[PDB]
Amino acid sequence: NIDGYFKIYSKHTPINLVRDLPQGFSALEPLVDLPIGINITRFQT
Amino acid sequence: GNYNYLYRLFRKSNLKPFERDISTEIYQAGNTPCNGVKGFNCYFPLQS
Structure with a gap:
């Protein structure tokens, strides 16, 4: 959040692993950019 | 009086x-240190 801009970048990657992060380099393209402009301090899944 | 347009005083x-x-x-x-809603040196943050 820079000046309240809630930036969302995601990518799908087919992998074959069991317990660890994939070995390699992966990017993230912009899915959506949100100008929400609200105060954020703590999150939850 | 258009007192509705409040403003922070402090x-x-x-x-x-x-x-x-x-x-x-x-x-x-x-x-x-101060608490409550009123008191000396304890003023409402907004003025009109």
Whole structure:
């Protein structure tokens, strides 16, 4: 959040692993950019 | 009287550009810590 801009970048990657992060380099393209402009301090899944 | 346009009278620190402050808690302008809603050196943060 820079000046309240809630930036969302995601990518799908087919992998074959069991317990660890994939070995390699992966990017993230912009899915959506949100100008929400609200105060954020703590999150939850 | 157009008293509806309230405004903050005090502030603990100089706020940032495009920063919005709505909380109306009583400011502790005095040396001593303060609580409650009223008291000397304990003034309403907003004026009209």
